[PDB]
């Protein structure tokens, strides 16, 4: 029910595979907002509401690159 | 006290560059900063909410970090690691 921000590390990504990996991120449903993040910029954060987080991992790792890894969760407060 | 151990070793989060994050729409922006380090190296930054906790990956380790109404980081987290938590500027 409460939006979760979502931190993936995504390992060594190149430019194309933050963008194509914020593409897909987003269009996974429930998911509302997209961002590279960290200090590496190697972090895709989503926010969504009941996103599977198993199945958008799932999903970078057979369509964008082999290393991808939830780092990050917080409930967001109202 | 944990915040003159990092000093000792050369850390000021006043100096710290900021954390690369966003304002996401439609959610409260975060009014925490927090900095984390292996072995007092800047690892990586983030942003959380005051008076709250979030989950994340520190080493190999998934821990809870617990976030008071002063950003004020505390949990339990594996040796060699720090991490430090300000309000964000403004907040």
């Known amino acids: 029910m409460k939006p979760q921000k979502i931190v993936i590390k995504l390992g060594m990504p190149s430019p194309k595979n933050r963008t194509k990996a914020m593409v897909l991120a987003a269009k996974v449903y429930g998911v509302s907002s997209v961002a590279i993040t960290g200090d590496d910029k190697d972090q895709l954060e989503v926010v969504g509401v009941d996103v599977d987080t198993a199945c958008l991992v799932s999903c970078l790792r057979k369509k964008v690159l082999r290393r991808a890894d939830i780092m990050v969760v917080e409930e967001a407060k109202d | ?91």
Not at chain 2, 27 to 39: Q, R, V
Not at chain 2, 50 to 65: C, P
């Open chain 2, 1 to 91: 006290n944990e915040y003159i151990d990092a000093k000792k070793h050369g850390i000021d989060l006043s100096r710290e560059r900021a954390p690369n994050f966003v304002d996401h729409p439609g959610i409260p922006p975060s009014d925490c900063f927090w900095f984390l380090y292996k072995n007092y190296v800047r690892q990586n930054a983030g942003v959380c909410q005051s008076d709250w906790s979030f989950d994340m990956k520190i080493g190999q380790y998934w821990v809870t970090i617990h976030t008071d109404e002063g950003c004020r980081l505390s949990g339990i987290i594996p040796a060699g690691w720090l991490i430090l938590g300000m309000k964000r500027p403004g907040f």
